[PDB]
């Protein structure tokens, strides 16, 4: 139960491409601090909830999909995040008959938004640069 301390190589790998950063627990954790600094923190919370919906306990899928919608996407939602019209339409139409992939269109849209609007800036930020400088080569 040791604290996960990323090696230099691992942290450098987060700069290889967006999927390496987001698919790494410590990478997401670091990216999350930066997203909150840039006021778009809920984007990653939503992405993770959708990942769980997809590959998680499948007996509560129908229930979880609606919960996620009400928590992140509905008007006035507590953890509201914006998605475009075409995406919302597909999501709402899909929710009339919930299934494992009902939120995939929304999750992908948010994924591409983070990749397009935040990934590069993150790598150029003090948070990443500090993470890299502090990580050491064993």
Coordinates of C-alpha atoms in Angstrom, one line a residue:
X1 CA 0.0 0.0 0.0
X2 CA 2.9 2.3 -0.9
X3 CA 2.4 5.8 -2.3
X4 CA 2.6 5.7 -6.1
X5 CA 5.6 7.8 -7.1
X6 CA 6.1 8.0 -10.9
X7 CA 9.5 7.5 -12.3
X8 CA 11.0 10.1 -14.7
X9 CA 10.4 7.9 -17.7
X10 CA 6.7 7.4 -16.7
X11 CA 6.1 11.1 -16.3
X12 CA 7.9 11.8 -19.6
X13 CA 5.6 9.3 -21.3
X14 CA 2.6 11.4 -20.4
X15 CA 3.9 13.9 -23.0
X16 CA 3.9 11.2 -25.7
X17 CA 0.2 11.4 -26.3
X18 CA -3.0 12.2 -24.4
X19 CA -4.1 8.6 -24.0
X20 CA -0.9 7.8 -22.0
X21 CA -1.6 10.6 -19.6
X22 CA -5.3 9.9 -19.1
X23 CA -4.9 6.1 -18.9
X24 CA -2.4 6.6 -16.0
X25 CA -3.9 7.0 -12.6
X26 CA -1.2 9.5 -11.5
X27 CA -1.4 11.2 -14.9
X28 CA -5.1 11.9 -14.5
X29 CA -4.6 13.1 -10.9
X30 CA -2.1 15.6 -12.1
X31 CA -4.2 16.6 -15.1
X32 CA -7.1 17.1 -12.7
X33 CA -5.3 19.8 -10.6
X34 CA -4.5 21.7 -13.8
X35 CA -8.1 21.4 -15.0
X36 CA -9.4 22.9 -11.7
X37 CA -6.8 25.7 -12.1
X38 CA -8.3 26.4 -15.6
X39 CA -11.9 26.1 -14.3
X40 CA -12.9 22.9 -16.2
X41 CA -12.5 20.3 -13.4
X42 CA -15.8 18.5 -13.8
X43 CA -14.9 17.5 -17.3
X44 CA -12.6 14.7 -16.0
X45 CA -15.0 13.7 -13.3
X46 CA -17.6 13.1 -16.0
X47 CA -15.2 11.2 -18.2
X48 CA -14.4 8.8 -15.3
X49 CA -18.1 8.3 -14.5
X50 CA -18.8 7.4 -18.1
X51 CA -15.8 5.0 -18.2
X52 CA -17.2 3.3 -15.1
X53 CA -20.7 3.1 -16.7
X54 CA -19.1 1.4 -19.8
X55 CA -16.8 -1.1 -18.1
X56 CA -18.4 -1.5 -14.6
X57 CA -21.1 -3.5 -12.8
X58 CA -23.5 -4.0 -15.6
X59 CA -26.6 -4.8 -13.4
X60 CA -27.0 -1.1 -12.6
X61 CA -26.2 0.4 -16.0
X62 CA -29.7 1.8 -16.6
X63 CA -29.7 3.4 -13.2
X64 CA -26.1 4.8 -13.4
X65 CA -26.7 6.4 -16.8
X66 CA -29.6 8.5 -15.6
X67 CA -27.6 9.4 -12.4
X68 CA -24.7 10.6 -14.5
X69 CA -27.0 12.6 -16.8
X70 CA -28.6 14.3 -13.8
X71 CA -25.3 15.0 -12.0
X72 CA -23.3 16.4 -15.0
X73 CA -25.5 17.2 -18.0
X74 CA -29.0 18.3 -16.9
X75 CA -30.1 21.9 -16.7
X76 CA -28.8 23.2 -13.3
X77 CA -26.9 20.0 -12.7
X78 CA -24.7 20.2 -9.6
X79 CA -21.6 19.3 -11.5
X80 CA -22.8 20.7 -14.8
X81 CA -20.6 20.7 -17.9
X82 CA -21.5 21.8 -21.4
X83 CA -21.6 19.6 -24.4
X84 CA -22.7 20.7 -27.9
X85 CA -26.2 20.4 -29.3
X86 CA -25.7 17.4 -31.6
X87 CA -24.1 15.5 -28.7
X88 CA -26.8 16.4 -26.2
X89 CA -29.5 15.3 -28.7
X90 CA -27.9 11.9 -29.1
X91 CA -27.5 11.5 -25.4
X92 CA -31.1 12.5 -24.6
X93 CA -32.5 10.2 -27.4
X94 CA -30.3 7.4 -26.0
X95 CA -31.5 7.9 -22.4
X96 CA -35.1 6.9 -23.4
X97 CA -33.7 3.4 -23.6
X98 CA -30.5 3.3 -21.5
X99 CA -27.7 0.9 -22.2
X100 CA -23.9 0.4 -21.6
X101 CA -22.9 2.8 -24.4
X102 CA -25.6 5.5 -24.1
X103 CA -23.1 8.1 -22.9
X104 CA -20.3 7.2 -25.3
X105 CA -21.0 10.1 -27.6
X106 CA -20.8 12.5 -24.7
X107 CA -17.8 10.9 -23.2
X108 CA -15.9 11.1 -26.5
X109 CA -16.9 14.7 -27.1
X110 CA -15.5 15.7 -23.6
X111 CA -12.4 13.5 -24.3
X112 CA -11.7 15.4 -27.5
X113 CA -12.4 18.7 -25.9
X114 CA -9.8 18.1 -23.1
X115 CA -7.3 16.8 -25.7
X116 CA -7.9 19.7 -28.0
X117 CA -8.2 22.5 -25.4
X118 CA -6.2 21.4 -22.4
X119 CA -3.6 18.7 -23.1
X120 CA -0.9 20.8 -24.8
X121 CA -1.3 23.7 -22.3
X122 CA -1.0 21.2 -19.5
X123 CA 2.3 19.9 -20.8
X124 CA 3.6 23.5 -21.0
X125 CA 2.3 24.3 -17.5
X126 CA 4.4 24.6 -14.2
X127 CA 2.4 21.7 -12.8
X128 CA 3.6 19.2 -15.4
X129 CA 7.1 20.7 -15.6
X130 CA 7.4 20.5 -11.8
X131 CA 6.1 16.9 -11.8
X132 CA 8.8 16.0 -14.5
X133 CA 11.6 17.8 -12.7
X134 CA 10.8 16.1 -9.4
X135 CA 10.3 12.6 -10.7
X136 CA 13.7 10.8 -10.7
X137 CA 15.4 8.2 -12.7
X138 CA 16.0 5.2 -10.3

